[model samples]
Every structure is written in C-alpha cells, then in structure tokens.
Target: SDVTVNVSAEKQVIRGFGGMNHPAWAGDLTAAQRETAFGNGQNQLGFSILRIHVDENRNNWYKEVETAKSAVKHGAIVFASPWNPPSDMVETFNRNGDTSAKRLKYNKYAAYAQHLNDFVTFMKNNGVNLYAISVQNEPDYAHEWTWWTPQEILRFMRENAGSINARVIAPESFQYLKNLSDPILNDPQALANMDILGTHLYGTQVSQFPYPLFKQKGAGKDLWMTEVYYPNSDTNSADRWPEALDVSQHIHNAMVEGDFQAYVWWYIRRSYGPMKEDGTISKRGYNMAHFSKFVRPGYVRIDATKNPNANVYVSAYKGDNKVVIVAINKSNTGVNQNFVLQNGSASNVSRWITSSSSNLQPGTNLTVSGNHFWAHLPAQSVTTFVVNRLEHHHH
Candidate 1:
C-alpha cells in the first residue's frame, strides 16, 4: 500500500509526548532515569513534556521539584494534576447510591482555585514553571480519589478557573467520556476559562476519539490525552512483544483521529509503563520513542494516508526543516510499503525500527527520488522515518 504525506494539508500542532511522575505513589525517577526520559541524545526517550502530581498535602510538594527541575532543564513543558483537594476543602457526600463519595466542598471553590495557583507559584519559585494545571484527574472515575460531577466541573470553570495563575485543564475523565466535557464546551463562560481540554484514554475506543462539539466550539483551547496505560497494567506487561505495538497504534489514533495536541502516559517509570523498574526502555517505551524522539515539539501533524493497509497505521509531522513519519505494522508477516511526500522533497531519510527482537535499532537509510521512498516494514513493528533538509513547495 502507498502512504502519501501531504505537507500542504497540515493538522494540529503537536505540543509533545511524555508520561507522569508521582513520587508519593511509586517512586521518583533517579538522576540517570531522569536524563534517559527527557534527554534527546542517543538511547534516550526524548520526551518533551513532563506531568507531575499535585499532592494534596503542602509538605509533599517538595518531592516533585527535583524531577520537574531536571525535565525543565531539558526544555520540557511541565504540567500538574491533582487527585484530590486539600482535606479542608473536601467533604464526604452521598451521590448516585454511593454514600461515601468525596467531593470538593461547593463553598471552597474559590479556595480550591487558590490552591492550584499556589502550586504553580511554588513550582515557579523552585525554578520550574508549570505549563498547565488540571482541575482534577479522572473526576468521573474518582472512587479512589475525588469526584466532581459534570455540573460541578462547569461551575468551577465558570466561577473560579480564570483566577488560577497557570493555564487551566479541565475534566480529565478516565475514559475520555464526552459527557464530562460536553457541558464545558457548550457553556461559553466555562469554555472561556478552559485552556486545554484534558482527558484519559483508558478503555476509550477509537470510534469515540473525535469530538465534533469541541471542533465547533473549542477555537483556541488545546486538546490533550492527559493519562492512560494502554492494553493493560498487569505485572511485567511493558516487555510484551507485538503487544507493545498497540502503544504506537493508540498514539496514532490519538493524533490522527482525536486531533490531540499532546499525548501523555500514566507513569514515567513502572512495570507496565514505558520505562522498566531497572530504568531501561521497555518495548512500550521504544514504541513511544518512535514518535517522541523524532517528532519534537512545535511540529505540525501533516495530512497522511493514515491506514493504507490492514493493521498498518501511519502518521506524519513536519518541523522547521525536517519531516517525521511514524508507521506501525501489526500484521504477522512483513509488508513492503511505499511512501510519497506531496509538496515536499528530500534526498535521503533516516529511520529507526523496533520489533520482537530489536529495541529501537537504527535501520539502513533510504534515498528519496522524486519525493518518494519505499521500506520493508518488519512484522509487528514500529518504524519512524526522519527526512532532514526538507524542501516544501509553495504550490
């Protein structure tokens, strides 16, 4: 099958790709691990965004500074998400037959806003400026955290979100549930306060990725997949072969179908995450690096034949003078694929591939003639092609 990348037909501007860090839950990434995650050098993850937890307790806030500072030093955009408000600002409530649900006290809306602002200020004073702060993480699936009804979320956005210092992300639903965010998009006052519409992709089908209402109403706000662990979270699941290719496909659908500006995984380092407990990049990490390593921030997602063959996913992006293409082949047999770049030209291309046995190994460079190229996509693998010295045609 032939995949055509139309440089003239650009889509969303990619904010970045990254994972979250919660020192209180799992553990902080070591100095070496931090470098491996954020650095753009060889064998690094090349993540450009870092998500940190906003602890409810003020004292625990210090735990997040070290890793966040390191990520910032690497020119990564840092964001924060809170699982619950401060104890004083929260109270037990009876909702939908559950008598012990936790929620932010309605009267403390202004104070909650102040709390989020305080975190931003704290991070800034510690040499890490937060790019955005979420109102809540997985508000719809808050059995283990705090719950905010859709109406409550809208109320907070309408009345208090504007007072926060950093950009505000809202209603980070666990399943990218449209019901949780639709109210905000429909209400102009609430929508105006939201800077990014953040959601989680846990168990969310690709069919539910697109949001027509957001496309119609969210003129300036960014869309991001804030938290997710693809496939499953079972022990030692990160090293699973062929299964890891799902990570790349999930990202492909998120970028091409959902039009999300950023894609963030649930954890930076975990047994079921991108990085393993030993600080080594897992198969899942290599799949993510196929995009994060080459498609840097400020790049734009160009139009491409997203699925030219069965189980083959393709996505393309263009930076200042380079074009990046990520292709995933999930079939059991190898595929000889063709690629054509419209409105752009390049002489040679560099590629990296990850399959059952290899982990992001560099592949032989291919020469481009007449803005076209071909490659043998190994079975159940992810490949990223980088075209440097790109020339774009005006017409």
Candidate 2:
C-alpha cells in the first residue's frame, strides 16, 4: 500500500505527548525515572509534557515540585489537574438518587478559582511555570471524586476561569463526552475564558473522535486529550505485544480525526503505563515514543493518506526541517509499504521499529529518490520514518 504525505497541507499544531504524575497515589518518580520519562536521549521516553495533580491539601502541594522541576529542566511543559477542591469549599449533596455525592459549594466559586491561582503561583515560585491548569479532572465520572454538572461548570467558567493565572482547561470528561463541554462552547462568556478544552478517552470509540461542535465553536481554544490508558489497564498490559500497537492507532486517530493539540496518558510510570515500575520503557512506551520522540512539540500534523490498507494506519508531522511518518501494521503478516512525499524532497530517511522481537531498534537508513521511499513493515509492529534536511518544493 502507498501512504502519500502532502507537505503543503497541514493540520493542528502538536503541543506534545506525555503522561501524568500523582505522588499521593502512585508515589513520585525517582530522579532516574524522571530522566527516563522526560529525556530525549537513547532509551528515553522523550515526553514533552508533564501533568501533575493539584492536591486539595496545602501540605501535599510540595510533593509535586521535584518531578515537575526535573521535567521543566528537561524542556517539558507542566500542567495541573485537581480531583477535588479543598475540603472547606466542598459540600455533600443528593443528586440523581446518590445521597452522598460531593460538589464545590456554589458560594465558594471565587475561592476555588483563587485556590487554582495559588497553585500556579506556587509552581512558578518553585521554578516550574505550568503550561495550563484544569478546573476539574473527569468531572462527569466523579463518583470517587468531585462532580460538577454542566450548569455548574459553565457558571465557574463564565464567572471565575478568567481569574486563573495560567491557561485554564475545563470539564475534563472521562470519555470525551460532548455533553459535559457543549455548554461551555455554546456560551460566549464561558468559551471566552477557556484556553483549552481538555477531555479523556476511556472507552470512546474511534468513530466518535471528531467533534463537530468544537470545530464550529472552538475557534481559538486548544483541544487536548488529557488522560487515558489505551487497550486496558490490567496487570502487565504495558508489556503486551501486538496489543501495544493499538496505542499507535489511538494516537493516529486523535491527531487526524480529533484534531487534538496534545495527547497525555494517565500515569507516567506504572505497571500498565508507558514506563514500568523500575524506570524502563515498556512496549506501549515504544509505541508512544514512535510519535513523541520524533514528532516533537511545535510540529504540525500534515496531510497524509491515513489508511491506505485495511490494517495499516499512518500519520505524518513536519518540524525542525524534518518529516516524520509513523506507520502501523496490525496484521499478522508483514507488509511492503510505499511512502510518497508531495511538495517535499529529502536525501535519506532514518527508521525505527518496534515489533514482537524488536524494541524501538534502529533500522538501516533508506535513501529517498523522486520524493519517494519504500520499506517492509513487519507484522503487528509500529515503524517511524524520519526524513531529515527536508526540502519543500513547488511545481
């Protein structure tokens, strides 16, 4: 199959790719693990973004500084998401038959906004400037956390979001459910205050990836996939082969179909996350690296023949005088795939592959002739081809 990449056509700007870190629940990443997660050197994950939790308790605020400091030193952007507001601002209430549901007190909206601002200031004082801060994490699925109905969230956005010191993200739905964010888009006052529309993809189908309303109403705000663990979170899921290929396809759909600026995983290091407990990149991490390591922040997603084959998925990005093409073959047998570049020329292409037997191993370089290249894509594997010193030409 032929995957054609049109350099002249471009899509969303890539903010970056990364995962979350929560010290209270999963413990903080060690100094070595922090390097493994954020560094771009060999055997590193090359994550460009870091999501940290904003604990309600002031005593635990310092727990997030060390890793965040390391991430910033490595040239990564940091953001915070809170699962609950400070205990003083929350009130128990009955809603939809749940008698013990929790929510932020209506009268304390201003205080909640101030709390978020204080966190932004704290991080900045500690030498970490947060890129953005979310109003709530998975507000719709807050059975275990704090819940915010659409009306309540809209009220907060219209009245308080503008006061935040950093870029404000809001209504982080657990399934990218539009219902939780539609009000914010429709309301001019609410939409004006939101800098980024963050959502999670728990069990969201690929068909539902494209958001029509956001396309029509979200002219200036960024769309970000803030949290998710693809396939499943069962034991040792990160090491599962072939299953890990789904991560590549998921990211492909998010970039091409959803038009999301950033893609963030749930946890940075865990048994079923990108990095294992001992600070090594897992198979799933390799799948993420195929994009995160090469595509990079500030790169733009370009036009490409996304799926030239039934089981083949492809996406392309251009930045730093290079073109990156990530191709995934989910079939049981190898595929001879061809790539054609339009309005672009390159001398040679470097390749990396992760399959059942390989772990992001470097492959022999392939020279480009007539703006085209071809290679064998192994079965159930993800391969990334990078064209350096790219030259854009016109007819």
Candidate 3:
C-alpha cells in the first residue's frame, strides 16, 4: 500500500557525478587519502569525474598535479577551470569600491587564450591530460575574481578559442544565469567552440532551472552542474545526517529536472563535504555513494515512475543491461517500494542504503520474485538497488 516504481524509458547517458579536487585546499592529502576520495573499487565513492582549479600563479602546482595523476590512475575523468587570469593580464577597475570589474585586458585576449592552452599542455606534460577546460569559473560574479562581460567572452571564443588544444567549457555561470550564455548561443561560431555548457546552481531555485536557451542553442554539448554544496548550520562538524540526505535529493532534482550530464560538488573533503578534512567519508559522502557507486559512467537515466506519496522520491538507470534504482524515504516511518520492470526481468537484486542508522550498508535480506521485487526503505534514508545482468540474467 505504498509507492510503485516502473523502471523504464531510458533517457540521457549520464557522464557522471563528481567533486572539485583543487590543490589550494586538498593538495596536502596523502596518495592513499586521495585514493579514498577518487577510487572506483569496493568501499569507494567510484567517482568517474573530477574538477580541478587552474591557478594562475601555479602555487602548489606540483602537489595538485600529483593528486590528479593519482585520480587518473583510479580511472577518473578530469577537467579544470581558471578562477582568475594572471595578475599582469588583468586591469583592476574600481566599479563599486570593491573592484567589480577585475577583467582581462582588451588586447590581451590572444595571450590569455595561450595561457590557458599552456596550462592544459603543462598538465598533459605532467601525465594528467584534461578531459575539458572551462574559460572562467563564474564570469558574471567576478567581483573577487576576474570578470568577463558576455560580449568579451564571445569575442574571445570567436577569435582565440581554437588556440586551446583541448575541449572547451564556458560561462560557468554562478547562479545558472541565462544572460551570460545568450550571446554565445546566438553566434554559431562561438557556440561551435563551446564543448560544454557548464553552470553552478548555487543559491538557485529549482523553478529557474532547465536553461532552454542553452539546451536549444547549444545542442550536442554536455550540460553540467559544476558546483554546489549543502552546508551545515553548525559548521563545526560533518556528522549531520539530515543535511546529507538533502544532498541526495539535490542530486535527484538536478538530474530529473535540470537534465544535467554531470553534477560536481564544491569540495571533496571540506568539513561540510563528502569527506571530512580528516579524510573519512562522511554521511554526505555516503549519500552521494547511493548514486556514484552503482550508477557507473555510460549509464543512461531511465524513466522510473516515482512514488505519488509526497515524501518519497525515486529514479532509475540502465547500463549494459544492468539496472539500478535509487529511492529516498522522507517520512517518519519506513516505506515499502515495489519495482515493476517492463520488457525485462531479473532473478536477484542487490540493495544498499544510508540512513540515520546505516552507512552505505548492503541489504542481505532482499530477494527478487521474477521481474518484480519490494524492499522496506527506512525513514530519512536513501537506498540503491542494482541488478547485474551478467550474474542474475534469468528471465
């Protein structure tokens, strides 16, 4: 007498979920610690992607490069974005006594492009070839950093984007603003140079999502939610379980409504991040594990009929004939979830969960009956059920 989920209607092929592995903060982590955050095997987050900061001064650059190399060894897709152009390339403007217009020089457009290209080359020389490079980390909200007017970004793309050897990501809008990307889409040449439409959903409401302009104009490009973090009010401890569940919902809404190919968290090991600064994966990290662990890269997010019960949320995916379904129960009591598979069936399904009482613990009692199976989801919990077609391929 609860929610019935239908796992069908395959949608976007997920690129993967990940977090920022910036060196300015996490460069000191040991190799084993880095593996703890980026590894793919058992007891790992299985993060398939990583985002890095491309510092202009290259402070601790060697350390960051080493961390990235370790991540590559664990089979992670890596990308980097510049926070600011080099100091000499920028001219400070006293727009509002706080430097609102810290921008690149008008004539240095080509040089700035070359600088990014060189950074990419430097990373490649160090054995961490980047999957993509973003032009700027939040050009619209560049008060504390370098700002690029939408027009300036388009001009740079039109004139110098091809100079960068790797795939290009652009307009990492801080709040998923459309104005910053409107002109880039209007110009075919500028759009052609943009390989990914990356945006940050910081402080953005769900109603303002699914940027139709970017989706319609920048078709064939990857759409990514580059950065966001659910912060705790206490800020002193990373043991908040409720906020961690909130992050799992954040992942659900970002994929279901925004249709993002990748969702990257702000920091991997902050006090409020997936892993604590001490290198232990926190409840928040396990919340993400409900997705990252089972929903491997190349998995397509299939349509799963969600629970009509307002307190329950659900989604499903398929990869290599293997199916995975994620469900969250928000009410005060455990809810039963019955999965009705269409066009296919499986003999067994493995379930894992994180809740007020669990920590990504695997369920030992779940048994499959033909194409359908049900499980009891604990209150304030997130669970993932997987069907490996190679092992349990009957019927």
Model 3: how far residue 258 lies from native, Å: 1.1
Error of 3 at 307 (Å): 4.6
Q: Residue-wise lDDT of candidate 3 within 1-395, one digit each (tens)?
A: 33334445767778888888876655555677788767866667777788898887755456568878877888888899889888889997766675457888898898888888888888998999999999999998987888888998889878878688998988899988888888888999988898888898888888877777876787688888888886442454456866678888888888888888888987787778887777788788888888887788888887776654557888888886678888988887887767777655665788888988788888864556756787888889998888755354352
Residues 1-395 of candidate 2: C-alpha lDDT, one tens digit per residue: 68999988988999999999998899899999999999999999999999999999877899999999999999999999998999999999997998989999999999999999999999998989999999999999999889999999999999999899899998899999999999999999999999999999999998878999999999988999998898889777888888999888999899998999899998889899999987889999999999999989999999999998878999999998888999999999889989999987888999999998898899889999878989888999999999875555531
- In model 3, the Cα lDDT at residue 220 comes to 87
lDDT of 1 at 54: 91
> What's the true lDDT of residue 328 in model 3?
88
lDDT of 1: 0.92
The residue ranges of model 1 lying beyond 4 angstroms of the native Cα positions read: 390-395
Which scores greater on TM-score, model 1 or model 3?
Answer: 1
Q: Please give the ranking of all candidate structures by lDDT, highest first, separated by commas.
A: 1, 2, 3
The superposed Cα distance between candidate 1 and the true structure at residue 299, in angstroms, equals 0.4
State TM-scores per candidate: 0.98, 0.98, 0.93
In candidate 1, the residue pairs with backbone N, CA or C atoms under 3 Å apart (3 or more residues apart, or in different chains) clash, namely none
RMSD of 3: 2.4
